[PDB]
Amino acid sequence: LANFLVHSGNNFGAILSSTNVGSNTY
Amino acid sequence: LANFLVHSGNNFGAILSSTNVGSNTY
Amino acid sequence: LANFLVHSGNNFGAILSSTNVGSNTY
Amino acid sequence: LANFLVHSGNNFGAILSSTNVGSNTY
Amino acid sequence: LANFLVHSGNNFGAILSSTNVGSNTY
Amino acid sequence: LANFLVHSGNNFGAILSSTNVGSNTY
Amino acid sequence: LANFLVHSGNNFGAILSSTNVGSNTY
Amino acid sequence: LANFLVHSGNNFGAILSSTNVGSNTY
Amino acid sequence: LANFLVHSGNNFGAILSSTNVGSNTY
Amino acid sequence: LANFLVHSGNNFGAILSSTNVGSNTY
């Protein structure tokens, strides 16, 4: 069906794919 | 069907794809 | 059908694609 | 059918594509 | 069905895939 | 000032109050 | 100031209050 | 200032309050 | 300042308060 | 400042407070 499959009744969480997240604190 | 598949009844979470997120704190 | 597929009954979450998000705090 | 597909019954969330979002706080 | 499958009743946790997360503290 | 207060610079998200949302799929 | 306060620069997410959301799948 | 306070630069997530969410799958 | 305080640069996660979430699978 | 304080640069996780979550599987 798919390479990735998320099946839920209620969903509240984030879903990231091919993302670049970065944090810099000075 | 797809490379990525999200199937839910109620959805409340963010869905990111090929995104660049960045935070800088000074 | 698609490379990405979001199937829901009620949707409330944001859907980002190829987006650049940035925050700077001084 | 498409590269990205969003199928819902009721939709309330934002859908961004190729967008640049930025916030600066002084 | 899929290479990865997440089946739940209520979901609250993040789901990352092919993501690069980084933090730098100075 | 108020029981609920939403203060933003740019707003794009829906704001619901005392609403009844329902979806039925057959 | 308020019982609930949401202060942001850019807002894209939904804000629900005293809402009843329901989904039925057959 | 408030009983609940959400302060961000960019916001993308849903904010629920006194909400009743329900899903039924047959 | 508040009883609950969420301070972030970029926010993507849901924020629930006094909510009742329920899922029934048959 | 607060009874509970969440301070982050980028946030992706759900934040629950005074919530009742329930799942029933038959």
Numbering used by the authors:
A (entry chain H), B (entry chain F), C (entry chain D), D (entry chain B), E (entry chain J), F (entry chain A), ...: 12 to 37
Show me the paper's own sentences about this structure.
Human islet amyloid polypeptide (IAPP) is a 37-residue polypeptide hormone that is co-secreted with insulin from pancreatic β cells and plays an essential role in glycemic regulation. IAPP forms amyloid deposits in the pancreas of >90% of individuals with T2D.43–45 A single genetic mutation resulting in a serine to glycine substitution at residue 20 (IAPP-S20G) is associated with familial, early-onset T2D.46,47 Recently, cryo-EM structures of IAPP amyloid fibrils assembled in vitro for the wild-type (WT)48–50 sequence and IAPP-S20G48 have been determined, as well as those of patient-seeded WT IAPP. Here, we used cryo-EM to determine structures of amyloid fibrils at different times during in vitro fibrillation of a disease-related variant of human islet amyloid polypeptide (IAPP-S20G). Strikingly, the fibrils formed in the lag, growth, and plateau phases have different structures, with new forms appearing and others disappearing as fibrillation proceeds.
Based on these data, we selected three distinct time points to solve the fibril structures present to high resolution using cryo-EM: 3 weeks, representing the late lag phase, 6 weeks, representing the growth phase, and 22 weeks, representing the plateau phase. 2D classification of fibril segments from the cryo-EM images revealed that ~30% of the fibrils in the 3-week dataset display an ~21-nm crossover distance, which was not a major component in the 6- or 22-week datasets, consistent with the analysis of nsEM images. A single solvable fibril form representing ca. one third of all fibrillar IAPP-S20G imaged was present at 3 weeks. These fibrils yielded a 3.0 Å resolution cryo-EM map that contains a 2PF fibril core with a 21 nm crossover distance, into which an atomic model could be built for residues 12–37 of each subunit. Despite these differences, the 3-week IAPP-S20G and WT IAPP fibrils share some similarities: they have a similar crossover length (21 vs. 25 nm), have a conserved inter-subunit interface involving the major aggregation prone region of IAPP (residues 23–27), and share a similar backbone conformation across residues 15–28. The remaining 68% of fibrils at the 3-week time point have no discernible twist, and their structure(s) could not be solved by helical reconstruction. The balance of sub-unit folds underlying the different fibril structures also changes as assembly progresses, with the P-fold found in the earliest fibrils in the lag phase, followed by the L- and C-subunit types in the 6-week sample, with the L- and U-subunit folds dominating at 22-week time point.
